[PDB]
Enzyme design. Sequence first.
Site, mmCIF file in Angstrom:
data_model
loop_
_atom_site.group_PDB
_atom_site.id
_atom_site.type_symbol
_atom_site.label_atom_id
_atom_site.label_comp_id
_atom_site.label_asym_id
_atom_site.label_seq_id
_atom_site.Cartn_x
_atom_site.Cartn_y
_atom_site.Cartn_z
ATOM 1 N N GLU A 24 -3.384 -51.959 44.250
ATOM 2 C CA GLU A 24 -4.575 -51.501 43.576
ATOM 3 C C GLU A 24 -4.441 -51.982 42.131
ATOM 4 O O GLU A 24 -3.352 -51.796 41.568
ATOM 5 C CB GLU A 24 -4.668 -49.992 43.604
ATOM 6 C CG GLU A 24 -6.008 -49.496 42.988
ATOM 7 C CD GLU A 24 -6.084 -48.026 42.559
ATOM 8 O OE1 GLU A 24 -5.080 -47.340 42.607
ATOM 9 O OE2 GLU A 24 -7.139 -47.544 42.158
ATOM 10 N N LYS A 80 3.021 -45.294 38.783
ATOM 11 C CA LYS A 80 2.224 -45.910 37.729
ATOM 12 C C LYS A 80 1.549 -44.876 36.815
ATOM 13 O O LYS A 80 1.216 -45.186 35.673
ATOM 14 C CB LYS A 80 1.148 -46.811 38.286
ATOM 15 C CG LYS A 80 1.613 -47.972 39.141
ATOM 16 C CD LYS A 80 0.355 -48.768 39.484
ATOM 17 C CE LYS A 80 0.431 -49.226 40.921
ATOM 18 N NZ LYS A 80 -0.782 -49.903 41.336
ATOM 19 N N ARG A 132 10.262 -46.541 50.463
ATOM 20 C CA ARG A 132 10.028 -47.143 49.180
ATOM 21 C C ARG A 132 11.292 -47.263 48.353
ATOM 22 O O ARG A 132 12.291 -46.595 48.669
ATOM 23 C CB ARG A 132 8.975 -46.353 48.413
ATOM 24 C CG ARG A 132 9.356 -45.014 47.890
ATOM 25 C CD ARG A 132 8.199 -44.563 47.087
ATOM 26 N NE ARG A 132 8.630 -43.526 46.193
ATOM 27 C CZ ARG A 132 9.167 -43.796 44.998
ATOM 28 N NH1 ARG A 132 9.400 -45.033 44.532
ATOM 29 N NH2 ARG A 132 9.550 -42.772 44.239
#
Length: 529
Positions: free
Chosen positions: A27, A263, A253
């Site tokens: 994104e 983020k 992850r």
Amino acid sequence: TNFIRQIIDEDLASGKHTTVHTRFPPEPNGYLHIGHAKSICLNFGIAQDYKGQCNLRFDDTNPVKEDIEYVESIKNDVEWLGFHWSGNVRYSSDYFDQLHAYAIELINKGLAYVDELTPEQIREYRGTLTQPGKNSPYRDRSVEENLALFEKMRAGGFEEGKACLRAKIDMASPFIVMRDPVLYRIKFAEHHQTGNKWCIYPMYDFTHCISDALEGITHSLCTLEFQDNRRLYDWVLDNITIPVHPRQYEFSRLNLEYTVMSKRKLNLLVTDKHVEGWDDPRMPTISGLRRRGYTAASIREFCKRIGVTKQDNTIEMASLESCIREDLNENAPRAMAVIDPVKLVIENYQGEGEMVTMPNHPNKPEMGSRQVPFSGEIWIDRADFREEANKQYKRLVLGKEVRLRNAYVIKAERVEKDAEGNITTIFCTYDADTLGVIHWVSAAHALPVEIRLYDRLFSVPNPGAADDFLSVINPESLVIKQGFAEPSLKDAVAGKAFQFEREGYFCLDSRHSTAEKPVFNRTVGLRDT
RNA sequence: GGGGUAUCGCCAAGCGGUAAGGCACCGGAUUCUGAUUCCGGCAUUCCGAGGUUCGAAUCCUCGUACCCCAGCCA
Ligand SMILES: Nc1ncnc2c1ncn2[C@@H]1O[C@H](COP(=O)(O)O)[C@@H](O)[C@H]1O
């Protein structure tokens, strides 16, 4: 090999597929980061290993968090790591008219409805992890009404939050995501691609599976929190006319020790000015790691080493650093620079200064040599002189001799102290035929170089698990020194990592360096045993 | 309530035939960088307990620990 590649070999072998097509869908709401690089290596690495394709798709469904600055930086870092996408850059907004057409299919089949429960109420009606949810009073409207209300939505007749489109699935499913997941919401916000054409935007779960289907993605790989979400991936695709059905697979992850990967948090560091910005050398972003002096080949090695599993994990920095060290030990031309300088004058020195030939790489003759100026007034680094020291210490004690790097065995004779018991110069003899080592810089021909000694941004291993990760910043994350380097470093290009002998690998920081005053970032230090 | 995961300090292979590999760590050889290189040392035991088998980290119980989900975020 890993579990995902064993799946892909099965799929090929069974004749389930003939080509693999993966995709990396960031994104655009922030700069990429070393976690993302794990996904880039996985997705683009499988593509080239299997002679398949890999798409770059900007998952731009949420306008109020995304900006065009990030789409261009993401393309930039994906290429810099050494990877290339297949065909053109794709964007979820490319499919905005397609997703809307599919939403209408779902409406026409009675599998979707316009709900008017407020943002607070839908949470109240959703149930909890132990209690099942309950049906919206708006759940049973006629297909005809839902069509009418959805176009009123599409034509901005409803305020934000005052209505949304939802899937009609099962409000008592143990999967919280299948309790009538929102498909569309209203955002009167200019989108960095579609301008103001749309003021209804699709949610991630609806967008993601239809996009993969449309691009013919054979395997959507993403991280473990999307395992429950896979149910909605398969439900949407089982209920619309689409000819293919990609399968989703999830791996764990990356968590790096002493840094925060969210983020939202990285954004706070930049916004509240606690780092220079996204590419600051302390940030775990790809551009920051680039400015720090890391090489795209070192990060690809990191990816290789950390594995791909279902296991939750936190890698120690010792792994990351190990990679860049190995790369730079092979490839970094050696040089000399003193970070904390104290003068050392050779009194026995006859002449105005000679020239010693120094190898550009001590174990690799192939990298050539350079002529570096030797002199009587050199510069040495402070910690290399001790007035009193025990046998282990092999540097310059006031009693014995040390070799200067690639020059003369000097011998300590007399210190001269600064009034505050500090020392200011050391006085030494040199043996004219002598060619415990220390590095040095001829004062006469020294270039003033600013040095940025970088250290881990946080003082706790898992700063993310802290009640306020900001209060746990390391105040010695960056300590700026003024030192001196051999004049050849005048031709350092930004992004060429030098090994300053007996210190660390350093690289020029294009962002602060100029001529006369260069700025050298320390990538990493040498293994100080 | 549901979905996942347990192998060395950190990571990771192992797919019924007798615990790889990397990082970190500890030696000792060699070095004009306390670096690099070499050599060696690193899990009789795989979350625990019980069962199948000739043989189990692998199979079958039954526990336990941790991660993830209640955004109109992704
Ligand atoms: N920490 C991480 N480790 C590995 N992959 C990640 C990580 N964070 C995000 N990704 C992957 O990056 C892609 C885009 O993530 P996002 O930036 O959240 O849109 C997805 O495949 C994510 O699963």
